[PDB]
Amino acid sequence: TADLKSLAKRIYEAYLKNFNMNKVKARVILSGPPFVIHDMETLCMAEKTLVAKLVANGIQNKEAEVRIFHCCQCTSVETVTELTEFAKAIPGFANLDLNDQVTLLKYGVYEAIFAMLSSVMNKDGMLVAYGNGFITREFLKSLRKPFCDIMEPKFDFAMKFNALELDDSDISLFVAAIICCGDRPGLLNVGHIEKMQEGIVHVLRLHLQSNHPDDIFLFPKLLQKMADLRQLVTEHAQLVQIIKKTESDAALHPLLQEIYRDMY
Template identity: 30%
Template sequence: MRAVPGQETSPDSSMYEPPTPTSSDIYPPTYHYSPDLTSFTPTGYNYTPQTTTSTIPFEITPDYVVDSTTFGDVRQTSLDPLPDSGAMSPVVSSGKGGEVFSPADPEQLAEIIARWVADAHLRTCLYSTEHILDVMRKQSPDITNINYYKNMAHEELWYDCAQKLTSVIQQIIEFAKAVPGFRKFSQDDQIVLLKAGSFELAVLRMTRYYDVNQNCVVYGDTLLPMEAFLTTETVEMKLVNNVFEFAKTIAELKLTDTELGLYSALVLLQADRPGLRGTDEISKLNEAVGRSLCLELEKTHRYPVKGDITVYAFLLAKMPALRELSMLHQEALSKFKRNAPHLQFSDLHKEIFNVDS
């Protein structure tokens, strides 16, 4: 069975602090990245070039579902094989005697996409929602832990955060590979999308760990406020502050896991990333995921965020802020590496962010 959407919710009033988006704001502008497309071969994740098709590049088999056995272990580092999204076309198997059909009903197709993306999202989260909520219920910010991180050496703090970020990115790569149609794209396009979107998706995943009641984030097995991560570097301070503000804004929407997974896929599948070639196929899949997200939100978030702005439009309007966070992270990382060229991060971290010492 598919992930069950949460109760109908109305966003907390504190989220209205950002400027109210208008209809002209919901289409994000083009931002320029400079990914090195020749070097990305992260250890353990092999990409096979795929040929593109002129049809919508995904297929879905509805008998592959999420159930209560998906989260046998709280820390989901050992995953069952995910379905290969590289063999996907618009054909759907009924699961009865090999009979197949093409879903003519857009809502039916959106429902199936939601189930697949939710499955990919849930199976590639490092910690289950139940575990995160349990930490939030049982713990409060501890001054000893806060001081430990505040007094941590600058390089040590960067290294610790980079290790945790790399673990999340490993799961994001698995998530992308399981999104219907993603592996239909060329190898180069997969690389561009992952390198451009990995930090943005990591920030979205952080929203699962954000406790809006205590303004803290679950970090490992403890709760930490923003000040635990602040340094004396201006760019780093801005990055930490903006990431926490963004996480709070999205967390206050109380998206279901299905909706957060679909929003993550929508952010990943941006056809305006510089260097992409198969933009038509990426745009088609992006539109299909967008329709699915819109229908899911209509079930649980019927009330507008403010005025006539729907939650879906609000989420679209936040996408430029995600890109700004990604560029700010790149700026902070580049400056840090110039000052600490001897500190080496993991190969995957170096491949994704492409920062030379």
């Protein structure tokens, strides 16, 4: 159908326009020159070049694990802004009640964040700082608990997600499907959201048939990844709560505090 073929392109176009990183761009960088962060020496070097404001305090600077945690949060905050503008190209999203738009983004942003993080991850590490650094997975594993425990589950998810070999045309529809879940708690107009979601899911199913004819199960596999991402976020929010309670130096950004507030 031409209207559905266009809906898929509108959403893909909105994705390419609103996210600073996409999978084609990430793959070009990941092939090879981002500065490699693989130990404490190179973390401190990268900090002086890529985030110099943070380490300009002398002995007042925070422990390395907490600086990394802060920089991960700053990355998330940026992605929430990108996700918020992308959400307007989903048909009917801007016609939803303003409160419903807030609730959908509230529960969807971290599922979308972890899905899209896969695009900049490989089995050895991930791009950081707008593509200018690459931090190794082994370095992130080396951080003291509980900060190391934030990281590896996201790689575990991404390695299996990346094995599906989706492209940006697929992932844009997937992220839109994540944002339009009609079973989020607190929704006012559930019925309208379900019809909005059904239209996107309908385009996602047809698109996957067209773009991945070799994988007859790809649509139900992606439905399962959405459920897996919900569980990943529930687990992530618990671990973030442990850090907030037990690490007095690891302040939560206020935008992320509101996202987490009464989430799970």
